[PDB]
Design a protein around this nucleic acid. Structure first.
Ligand SMILES: [Mg+2]
Ligand SMILES: [Mg+2]
Ligand SMILES: [Mg+2]
Ligand SMILES: [Mg+2]
Ligand SMILES: [Mg+2]
Ligand SMILES: [Mg+2]
Ligand SMILES: [Mg+2]
Ligand SMILES: [Mg+2]
Ligand SMILES: [Mg+2]
Ligand SMILES: [Mg+2]
Ligand SMILES: [Mg+2]
Ligand SMILES: [Mg+2]
Ligand SMILES: [Mg+2]
Ligand SMILES: [Mg+2]
Ligand SMILES: [Mg+2]
Ligand SMILES: [Mg+2]
Ligand SMILES: [Mg+2]
Ligand SMILES: [Mg+2]
Ligand SMILES: [Mg+2]
Ligand SMILES: [Mg+2]
Ligand SMILES: [Mg+2]
Ligand SMILES: [Mg+2]
Ligand SMILES: [Mg+2]
Ligand SMILES: [Mg+2]
Ligand SMILES: [Mg+2]
Ligand SMILES: [Mg+2]
Ligand SMILES: [Mg+2]
Ligand SMILES: [Mg+2]
Ligand SMILES: [Mg+2]
Ligand SMILES: [Mg+2]
Ligand SMILES: [Mg+2]
Ligand SMILES: [Mg+2]
Ligand SMILES: [Mg+2]
Ligand SMILES: [Mg+2]
Ligand SMILES: [Mg+2]
Ligand SMILES: [Mg+2]
Ligand SMILES: [Mg+2]
Ligand SMILES: [Mg+2]
Ligand SMILES: [Mg+2]
Ligand SMILES: [Mg+2]
Ligand SMILES: [Zn+2]
Lengths: 129, 155, 144, 81, 87, 150
RNA sequence: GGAUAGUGGCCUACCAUGGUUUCAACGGGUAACGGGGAAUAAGGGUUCGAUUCCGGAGAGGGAGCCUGAGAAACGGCUACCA
RNA sequence: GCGGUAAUUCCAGCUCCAAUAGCGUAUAUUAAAGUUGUUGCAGUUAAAAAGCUCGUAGUUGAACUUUGGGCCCGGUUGGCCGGUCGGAUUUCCAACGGGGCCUUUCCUUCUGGCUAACCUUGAGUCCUUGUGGCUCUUGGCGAACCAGGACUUUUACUUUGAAAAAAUUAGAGUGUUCAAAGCAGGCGUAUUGCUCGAAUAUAUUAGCAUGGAAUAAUAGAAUAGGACG
RNA sequence: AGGGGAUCGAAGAUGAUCAGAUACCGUCGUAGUCUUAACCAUAAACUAUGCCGACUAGGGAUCGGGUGGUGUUUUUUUAAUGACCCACUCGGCACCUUACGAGAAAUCAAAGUCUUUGGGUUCUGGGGGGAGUAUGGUCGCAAGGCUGAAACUUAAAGGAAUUG
């Protein structure tokens, strides 16, 4: 049954990109999905999106360009200890110069660079490049 | 646990050096001593209103509370005036970078000032060795029962 | 995801499971059974010293044709009886029955060398001296 | 395909879809007011019946149930709301 | 892809699909650059003057070349009807 | 989906966006709640009521015209039964299935079904039990269940 | 209650029926003293630590004890076994 | 894999290679090994999906509850000037962050002790035409925390921090003649002394202390045996 | 252990064939083959392909359900029916073409969305032989089932495709 609802959204986005498309209807949305979709958008990897409102859990239409190669989810939200973040991005980001590991801290869902600038840490969500 | 009789042993149960002079006609029969264990634990009224004798009671008896203060959930109440709690906790395995569920059972003395049932979360305070295994004392009930009266009959 | 539980508490499953499958490793099983110490002629040790019983003439394996010149040795610490190879041209002339010899491995983790069948050891010294030196001429075999 | 509007899709292709795969799901059943001119008043009936609905006063009939929409009974009228 | 002090380093900044904005890399000898000519007052095709679009091999491979062309040209001004943003 | 079979049927009411209204619905809270209880009094199940109220009357959903699910209205009027309705209809099945298996020990497939039915019972109970709607220590027993449903 | 430097089934009376366990009790194995650490170098790991420091245990094997502030001591005693 | 008569593998001579006060060999272990696979394996046919379903332990488990907007305070890098006799701070400016406010908004709570802070103002004013500026008592801020009472749903995570042996490890300083080391040493009036050292970091799992309130659990009010007085 | 025992037919006996012929082919035909009560629990029990969830691509048939229609055919007086037809839509058993993609390949709408490596979970494998052998446990009347090693040996065994 439906496990990580973040998982399906991320995946669907990736396949929409891979098939050379420009939209995905995603379902069922969630606080966490928006806040994630939000961080991508902040950095160019998608366009604008839209919460549609079935009186259920929601749908989201994402508009995307093509700047995006991959946006995965880290399936168990491991804990990360301000130092291990180095080792994370190193494992799953194509170069030191760009790309983001986004994660979840006590002070909000934020990519690893804002995470480093605010000097907080927490669990790990997914990633974008 | 105690309950009833109170003077039910071969020896006379009493509080040490808490003399009550029979010459002096008094209205309460027995003079009773008590304290607050401190650290913020209310000495429940059933300890002051009580007539039980338990020298291992942290409010009415001669034990001091110091060292670890622990909470755990009650899973055995079959031992007269003592119980066995379970304290769960996950345990971190590095190499796998995940934890596994573990637990331990701590035996702890329980004064007739509390009325503990299996399932109650309880806080205990560390002790001087009180029996072969018990090194703790029930110091506060955090629970109640778990909505038992809301398991009654039909409409 | 196939098999392996990905969960965040599944550590215990994940460890145990490994524990189990380590046993399919030939070196891990060998180590923990103590096959070294239990079976196996040498004590677990690197060499071992025994006494020469008979001089043999092992015929090689195919597609080789040879007679391979070896010695049955009875390990001193052990009594265990073992057949060992005597390397280099001659050398079977150096030994003689009832002489002491220092056996060593063949560098194959147990397991016989080439066309020599059964033999898992080789001679290194006799009467305390070394086949090698003897072979050259740098040293001589002791009195008796 | 490749680029289109998921948000504002055509009334017709939406129309033909399954009631669960529309943009926001809704029913496609309806209610009606039914008459059998022996009487003067009008019972309100759901397009899908299960219960063979009887009229207010007379044990007459109205509709029978089926796999889906009810079969209305013989001499009857109906408006929809 | 600059450098320490400004200075354009690393050669060849590639083209790009006008449909998908993926890179149109060298051995993609299956992609296409379509030059649509600019016209003037009464026919007349103005030699050497185009509105152009580049479509990645992938896109033409997937058949999406004729639909995505439509959209591009139409919403750039050289079609009216033909295409519909909705379905 | 589909717990005890390999069926994959999607199929469900598709509830309306319109959380209130229908606007063309006259009557009143008063009107319908009374209608519920009179049927509940005939011995009807909250399901049976919803259905009966759906076709004959115009009750699109009972929870709308009265912000209250049909079961809660019944409880509130004391009409709630001992055990829940679904739980009931499961038991009742296992009782009929069992009765058949007594009469036909040769039917292995009945034996197989009964397990399934009872497994579902036993699981459902434990849910209800967990959330205190069923007394902790409730228990479906084959012997006793036949007297239970009837 | 007795015993102890003192808590404590430590031991004894009386009384009760408890304590642990698939979150692995109990049992077996260890060619097991535990740590600080050692070896291997992308990382994650894997293997090792009798052995210069800290802790513990022993003095051929067991038990017992004198003296003493401190030993159940062994370059102390007593006994048995070897 | 070579050797059964011209052996590029043996036994030698010559010449030649590699490492060199050291080089071979045996045993063990580590790397190679993503051949134990958390990172990270493989299971149609190569080794490997239990004949089938049910099912307890175990692991896992949809969405939803203060978001958005407005105001103030004070930091640390960086620019454009440098005022100045390499570094300085104000105004201009961006940038990234911390604190506290008001928006219907418990901050555990009463009973004083305490006040640092402006709704104050009591005077006016250094001085750029004045809200640029702080001293300054007489109505009017709580929380900054003392201490006494009365009570408090439980957790996981993460942050900073305390407590913390040395030697080892990483690593600063120092020319043991170099170096492995060592923790010395360096300066003069080398006749009566001057002087820099003997750092720092790692120290995790547990326990303690503190900041956070996302993610993930938990408990709450339905036969009202509810909540505030 | 009863019944039943038409048929075909482990075993046995035969006729031929053969150098031999304990077989293949032919005949006789015990057990069996069917059934009740009880055991046994294994099959290449195979799709040699775990289950739940998501996403990624085209096409025509068909099976069950449904909806839409001034569709065809049924005549009667039009209908009502039923069968049929055409478009859609769920959920089936499958075939076709592609293949963005995957693979050592054959091939695969999953065997895809994997070095751009993480949705959840179960099980099994770790060179070949030794060997499903020894042993202990356990189930069974038995036959046997489940669990299930090591010593020793060995440089390949194996898979898919190619050319002969
Ligand atoms: Mg007892
Ligand atoms: Mg095996
Ligand atoms: Mg022999
Ligand atoms: Mg010996
Ligand atoms: Mg299931
Ligand atoms: Mg489904
Ligand atoms: Mg249905
Ligand atoms: Mg006692
Ligand atoms: Mg007992
Ligand atoms: Mg185990
Ligand atoms: Mg030992
Ligand atoms: Mg040691
Ligand atoms: Mg060790
Ligand atoms: Mg030793
Ligand atoms: Mg000693
Ligand atoms: Mg000795
Ligand atoms: Mg003894
Ligand atoms: Mg002694
Ligand atoms: Mg001595
Ligand atoms: Mg001594
Ligand atoms: Mg020659
Ligand atoms: Mg030669
Ligand atoms: Mg030579
Ligand atoms: Mg070397
Ligand atoms: Mg990991
Ligand atoms: Mg492999
Ligand atoms: Mg196979
Ligand atoms: Mg299978
Ligand atoms: Mg959730
Ligand atoms: Mg710390
Ligand atoms: Mg230092
Ligand atoms: Mg027969
Ligand atoms: Mg025969
Ligand atoms: Mg014959
Ligand atoms: Mg025969
Ligand atoms: Mg099998
Ligand atoms: Mg098959
Ligand atoms: Mg299809
Ligand atoms: Mg029709
Ligand atoms: Mg060979
Ligand atoms: Zn009527």
């Amino acid at each position: 049954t439906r496990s990580s609802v973040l998982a399906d959204a991320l995946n669907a986005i990736n396949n929409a990109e891979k098939t050379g498309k420009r939209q995905v209807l995603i379902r069922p949305s969630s606080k966490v999905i928006i806040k994630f979709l939000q961080v991508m958008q902040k950095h160019g990897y998608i366009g604008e999106f839209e919460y549609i409102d079935d009186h259920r859990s929601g749908k989201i239409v994402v508009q995307l360009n093509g700047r995006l190669n991959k946006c995965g989810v880290i399936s168990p939200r491991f804990n990360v200890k301000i130092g291990d973040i180095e080792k994370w991005t190193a494992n799953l980001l194509p170069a030191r110069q760009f790309g983001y590991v986004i994660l979840t801290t006590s002070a909000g869902i934020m990519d690893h660079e804002e995470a480093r600038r605010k000097h907080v840490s927490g669990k790990i969500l997914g990633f974008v490049y | 646990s105690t309950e009833l009789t109170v003077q039910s042993e071969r020896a006379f149960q009493k509080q040490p050096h808490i003399f009550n002079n029979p010459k002096v006609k008094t209205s309460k029969r027995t003079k009773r001593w008590y304290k607050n264990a401190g650290l913020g634990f209310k000495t429940p009224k059933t300890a002051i209103e009580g007539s039980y004798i338990d020298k291992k009671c942290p409010f009415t008896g001669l034990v001091s509370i110091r060292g670890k203060i622990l909470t755990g959930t009650v899973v055995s109440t079959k031992m007269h005036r003592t119980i066995v709690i379970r304290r769960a906790y996950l345990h971190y395995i590095p190499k796998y970078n995940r934890y596994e569920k573990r637990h331990k059972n701590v035996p702890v003395h329980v004064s007739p000032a509390f009325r503990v049932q299996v399932g109650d979360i309880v806080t205990v305070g560390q002790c001087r060795p009180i029996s072969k295994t018990v090194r703790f004392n029930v110091v506060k009930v955090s629970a109640a029962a778990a909505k038992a009266n809301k398991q009654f009959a039909k409409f | 995801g196939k098999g392996k539980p990905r969960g965040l508490n599944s550590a215990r499953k994940l460890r145990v499971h490994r524990r189990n499958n380590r046993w399919a490793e030939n070196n891990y099983k060998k180590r923990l059974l103590g096959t070294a110490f239990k079976s196996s002629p040498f004590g677990g040790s690197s060499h071992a010293k025994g006494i020469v019983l008979e001089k043999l003439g092992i015929e090689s394996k195919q597609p080789n044709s040879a007679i391979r010149k070896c010695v049955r040795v009875q390990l001193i610490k052990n009594g265990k009886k073992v057949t060992a190879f005597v390397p280099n041209d001659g050398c079977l002339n150096f030994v003689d029955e009832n002489d002491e010899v220092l056996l060593a491995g063949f560098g194959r983790k147990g397991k016989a060398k080439g066309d020599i069948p059964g033999v898992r050891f080789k001679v290194v010294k006799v009467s305390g001296v070394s086949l090698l030196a003897l072979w050259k001429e740098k040293k001589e075999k002791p009195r008796s | 395909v490749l680029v289109q509007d998921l948000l504002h899709p055509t009334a017709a292709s939406e129309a033909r879809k399954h009631k669960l795969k529309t943009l926001v799901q809704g029913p496609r059943s309806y209610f009606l007011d039914v008459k059998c001119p022996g009487c003067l008043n009008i019972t309100t009936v759901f397009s899908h019946a299960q219960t063979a609905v009887t009229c207010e006063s007379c044990s007459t009939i109205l509709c029978t149930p089926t796999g889906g929409k009810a079969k209305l009974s013989e001499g009857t009228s109906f408006r929809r709301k | 892809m600059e450098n320490d002090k400004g200075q354009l380093v690393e050669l060849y900044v590639p083209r790009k699909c006008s449909a998908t904005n993926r890179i149109i890399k060298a051995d993609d000898h299956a992609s296409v650059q379509i030059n649509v000519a600019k016209v003037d007052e009464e026919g007349r095709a103005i030699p050497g003057e185009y509105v152009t679009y580049a479509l990645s091999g992938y896109v033409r491979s997937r058949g999406e070349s004729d639909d995505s062309l439509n959209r591009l040209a139409q919403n750039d001004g050289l079609l009216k009807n033909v295409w519909s943003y909705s379905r | 989906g589909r717990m005890h079979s390999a069926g994959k049927g999607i199929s469900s009411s598709a509830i309306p966006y319109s959380r209130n209204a229908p606007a063309w619905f006259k009557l009143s809270s008063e009107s319908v709640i009374e209608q519920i209880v009179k049927y509940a009094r005939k011995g009807l199940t909250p399901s049976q009521i919803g259905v009966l109220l759906r076709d004959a009357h115009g009750v699109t959903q009972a929870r709308v015209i009265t912000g209250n699910k049909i079961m809660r209205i019944l409880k509130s009027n004391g009409l709630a039964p001992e055990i829940p309705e679904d739980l009931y209809y499961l038991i009742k099945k296992a009782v009929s299935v069992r009765k058949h298996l007594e009469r036909n020990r040769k039917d292995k497939d009945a034996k197989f079904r009964l397990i399934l039915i009872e497994s579902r019972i036993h699981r459902l109970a434990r849910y209800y039990r967990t959330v205190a709607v069923l007394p902790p220590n409730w228990k479906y027993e084959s012997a006793t269940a036949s007297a239970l449903v009837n």
